[PDB]
Structures are given as C-alpha cells and as structure tokens.
Amino acid sequence: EVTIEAVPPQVAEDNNVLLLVHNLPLALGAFAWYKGNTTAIDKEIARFVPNSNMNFTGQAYSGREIIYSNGSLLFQMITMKDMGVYTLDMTDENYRRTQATVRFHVHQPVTQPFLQVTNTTVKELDSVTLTCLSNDIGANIQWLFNSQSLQLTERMTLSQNNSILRIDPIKREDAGEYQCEISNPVSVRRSNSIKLDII
Amino acid sequence: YIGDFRCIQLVNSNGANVSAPSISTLTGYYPVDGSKFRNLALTGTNSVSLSWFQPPYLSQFNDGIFAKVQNLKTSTPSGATAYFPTIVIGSLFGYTSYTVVIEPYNGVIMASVCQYTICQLPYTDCKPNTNGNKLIGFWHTDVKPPICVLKRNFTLNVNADAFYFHFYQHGGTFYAYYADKPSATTFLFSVYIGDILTQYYVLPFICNPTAGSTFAPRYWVTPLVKRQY
Numbered sequence: 001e002v003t004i005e006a007v008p009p010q011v012a013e014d015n016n017v018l019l020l021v022h023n024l025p026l027a028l029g030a031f032a033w034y035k036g037n038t039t040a041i042d043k044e045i046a047r048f049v050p051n052s053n054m055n056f057t058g059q060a061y062s063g064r065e066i067i068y069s070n071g072s073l074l075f076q077m078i079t080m081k082d083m084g085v086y087t088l089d090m091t092d093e094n095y096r097r098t099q100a101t102v103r104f105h106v107h108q109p110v111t112q113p114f115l116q117v118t119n120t121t122v123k124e125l126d127s128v129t130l131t132c133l134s135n136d137i138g139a140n141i142q143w144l145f146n147s148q149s150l151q152l153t154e155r156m157t158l159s160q161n162n163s164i165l166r167i168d169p170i171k172r173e174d175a176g177e178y179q180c181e182i183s184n185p186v187s188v189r190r191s192n193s194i195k196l197d198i199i
Numbered sequence: 200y201i202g203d204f205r206c207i208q209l210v211n212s213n214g215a216n217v218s219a220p221s222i223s224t225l226t227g228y229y230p231v232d233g234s235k236f237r238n239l240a241l242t243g244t245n246s247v248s249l250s251w252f253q254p255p256y257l258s259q260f261n262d263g264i265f266a267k268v269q270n271l272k273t274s275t276p277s278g279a280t281a282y283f284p285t286i287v288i289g290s291l292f293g294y295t296s297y298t299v300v301i302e303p304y305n306g307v308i309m310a311s312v313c314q315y316t317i318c319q320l321p322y323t324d325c326k327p328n329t330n331g332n333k334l335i336g337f338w339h340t341d342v343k344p345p346i347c348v349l350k351r352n353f354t355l356n357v358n359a360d361a362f363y364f365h366f367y368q369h370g371g372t373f374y375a376y377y378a379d380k381p382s383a384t385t386f387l388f389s390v391y392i393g394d395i396l397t398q399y400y401v402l403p404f405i406c407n408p409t410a411g412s413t414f415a416p417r418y419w420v421t422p423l424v425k426r427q428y
C-alpha cells in the first residue's frame with residue numbers, strides 16, 4: 001500500500017528534502033500535505049486536484065515547497081523549524097485516508113573541534129586531561145587514538161559527557177596521536193591531533 | 200467554519216487576519232431607530248482566508264435581518280453570471296438541518312431550502328468554471344440530492360443599483376422579501392421549517408475583475424427586532 005519515504009531522512013540545513021510517495025492511488029479526488037500529525041486545514045501546506053491538474057496552497061505554505069502530481073513534496077531550504085512529522089492526506093469519492101505520515105530530522109553541519117592539553121610532553125605515572133572543546137552542543141563526542149577508536153580501558157575516565165578525557169597513570173603504551181571527533185547524523189569532523197611523548 | 204464537509208475547492212487558503220466588518224454611511228419586525236449596517240461582503244481573486252469563516256462574519260440570526268446589496272453586474276468580467284454575493288441562513292449547516300440558500304444566477308434569484316452538506320469554507324464565484332469536475336464543490340457537496348422544502352427561482356432586476364432583502368422567521372416559518380428600490384417591498388417566498396434558524400453567513404465572493412477596476416462587493420445588513428403587543 002501507500003508508504004512514504006524521506007529522501008534524505010536526515011537533512012543538513014539549507015539542503016532539500018523530498019517526501020517521496022510510493023505509491024499513490026491512481027484515481028484520486030484530491031490529495032494534500034500537512035504540517036505535523038494532523039489534517040487540520042490550518043496546517044495544510046499545499047494540495048493537488050488530480051482531475052484539474054491544478055495545485056493550491058494552504059496556511060502552512062512557506063513559499064519553498066512544491067507538490068507533484070505524483071504525491072511527492074519538495075522542501076527547498078530546510079530550517080530546523082521544518083523538521084517534524086508531515087501528513088499526506090488522500091481523498092477519493094469522497095472518503096479520505098489520512099494515513100501517510102513521514103518524519104524527517106534536520107541538523108546543522110558541525111564545525112571543527114579544538115583539542116586542548118595540560119602538558120603536551122607528559123611524564124610517566126602522571127595524569128593527563130584532554131578537553132574536546134567545540135561550538136556544537138548536541139553533537140556526539142568520540143575519542144580517537146592513532147585514527148582508530150580509543151580503547152576505553154580501566155584507568156581512563158570520561159566526564160562532562162565525553163568532553164574531558166582523563167588518564168591518571170600513563171604507561172608507555174599510551175604514547176601516540178590523540179584526537180576527538182564530533183559527529184551528528186549528517187556531519188563528522190576531527191580535531192587537531194595532539195602527540196603525547198611520555199618521557 | 201460552521202459547515203462540516205471538506206469540499207475539494209479551486210481556491211488557495213491563508214491564515215491572514217481580517218478587518219472587523221466596516222460600519223455604514225400582534226407580532227412585528229423592524230430595524231432600530233439610529234441603526235448602523237455592517238458590510239459583510241468578502242472578496243478575493245485567488246485565495247480565501249480561513250479567518251473569513253468565523254465570527255463576527257458568521258453572525259447570529261436572532262429576529263432576522265434587513266439587507267441591502269450592491270449590484271456588481273457592471274464591474275464583473277465578460278462571462279460572469281453572479282452579480283452579487285450569496286447569503287446562507289441556517290443553524291448547524293449539516294445534513295441534519297435545513298439551510299436557506301439565496302444565490303443569484305444571471306437574471307434570477309435562485310432560492311432553495313434543503314438539508315445541505317455545506318462546506319467548511321463555503322464560497323461563490325462571479326464566473327464559476329470547473330474543467331468538467333463534478334467532484335469539485337463551491338459552497339456544498341451532496342452525493343445524494345438533499346431533501347428540499349423549497350426550490351424556486353425568482354426574477355432579479357438585472358439593471359438596478361442595489362437590492363433590498365428582508366429575511367425573518369416566525370412560528371417556524373421563514374419569510375423572504377425582496378425589492379430593487381427602497382420605496383417598494385415585494386413578497387419573495389416563505390416556507391415552514393422544522394428547525395429554527397440561529398446563524399447566517401454571506402459567502403466570500405471571489406472574482407477576477409478585469410482592468411483597473413474597483414471590485415467593491417457590499418452586502419450591508421442590520422438586524423431586525425421582534426415585538427408582540
């Protein structure tokens with residue numbers, strides 16, 4: 001039956017999203033698109049009248065949305081405000097099947113994080129604190145050691161929700177190149193490397 | 200919107216505010232002394248506006264209304280057939296109840312009282328044209344022809360400045376009067392109704408007036424008062 005697929009499910013700010021409809025009924029009276037989980041006429045974005053090959057707008061129309069004869073809707077410059085569920089309503093004669101919905105998410109591309117060090121040339125059996133600093137509240141924070149994921153271990157601690165990595169005893173096997181990386185369902189960036197030479 | 204059916208309509212919608220209706224200039228019905236009429240005619244080219252379809256435009260019927268309506272015959276485009284806004288009197292506007300419809304077409308006043316399935320956003324066009332789409336509906340959709348209790352055409356004075364209507368109801372009977380000059384009054388029709396009419400509405404008149412033209416639909420209405428002696 002009629003499903004609906006966000007292309008893409010995760011859209012970066014100021015990129016387009018296509019609400020792709022598989023697969024419309026072939027003889028419809030009209031079908032419309034709404035903002036959110038609703039068919040309230042004040043949330044109507046645009047609308048299409050199949051027999052009249054004519055489109056129409058609704059209160060929620062933002063000016064950057066296109067409705068296609070084939071059911072699909074094109075957003076043009078997404079804004080965080082556009083993110084949510086969107087409801088496709090289909091009217092035959094004269095029954096209407098509410099019952100396409102789709103949800104998509106919008107995110108800001110992350111910027112490069114900065115990696116901070118206490119001593120860059122730390123002595124054996126002493127604590128190091130690494131701080132991943134960014135302007136990305138709501139980004140995920142992963143730790144890297146020689147390009148690969150940093151191995152958790154037993155004598156490492158991560159606090160400030162993965163913001164600060166602390167390692168008390170630094171045995172010689174902790175020598176290398178440290179980075180953090182912040183992710184985000186649409187972007188990944190890696191911090192400047194930091195090189196601990198445990199001397 | 201009072202009106203429950205979601206019509207499929209050839210008109211845009213927006214959520215704009217709308218200026219408050221603009222003010223004028225045994226048993227007996229009259230208008231009051233220094234009474235002041237309000238213009239309830241609304242107009243668009245392209246879109247209707249959702250705020251059009253609620254109070255104070257959707258108004259209380261009470262003891263009736265006295266109305267005078269400009270004839271826009273001469274400021275309409277070439278093929279046009281409706282020369283002024285349609286009005287709708289009724290209660291809940293559903294198939295459960297009688298709605299009076301007074302709608303001009305060409306030389307006639309089409310009067311009807313039926314159990315209409317009225318639209319959420321009922322409107323009228325000066326020159327209505329559907330590219331052969333029976334599903335389309337302007338002010339109502341009824342897949343079954345509704346029970347009527349009056350479907351009658353009356354003659355309109357095609358060339359005349361303004362028309363004067365009186366609509367009231369007593370003992371369940373609705374009474375309609377018409378004239379084309381304020382010096383006269385002529386009985387239009389009257390019919391007994393089982394419900395009692397509590398609300399009324401002048402449907403937005405949408406039209407593409409040609410050239411630099413002041414399309415000024417006006418539908419001025421004051422209320423009537425009852426008195427028994």
Ligand SMILES: *[C@@H]1O[C@H](CO)[C@@H](O[C@@H]2O[C@H](CO)[C@@H](O)[C@H](O)[C@H]2NC(C)=O)[C@H](O)[C@H]1NC(C)=O
Pocket residue numbers: 018020021022068070072074
């Ligand atoms: C319905 O119409 C839309 C818009 O034309 C289609 O979305 C396009 O898919 C085509 C391939 O058929 C690509 O060339 C375009 O890049 C897509 N649209 C864009 C960029 O907005 C959709 O695939 C159509 N077909 C359906 C629903 O089966």
Ligand SMILES: *[C@@H]1O[C@H](CO)[C@@H](O)[C@H](O)[C@H]1NC(C)=O
Pocket residue numbers: 037085101102103
């Ligand atoms: C909209 O709400 C109903 C509530 O039961 C639910 O079935 C439906 O999945 C919702 N749409 C979503 C989550 O996209």
Ligand SMILES: *[C@@H]1O[C@H](CO)[C@@H](O)[C@H](O)[C@H]1NC(C)=O
Pocket residue numbers: 046055056057065066067068
């Ligand atoms: C409606 O259709 C026209 C003609 O194809 C197109 O130019 C326009 O962008 C469409 N508008 C909307 C809101 O979808």
Ligand SMILES: *[C@@H]1O[C@H](CO)[C@@H](O)[C@H](O)[C@H]1NC(C)=O
Pocket residue numbers: 304307309350351352
């Ligand atoms: C009223 O006018 C229209 C004009 O086309 C006509 O079709 C209809 O039959 C008329 N109604 C009555 C009751 O004669």
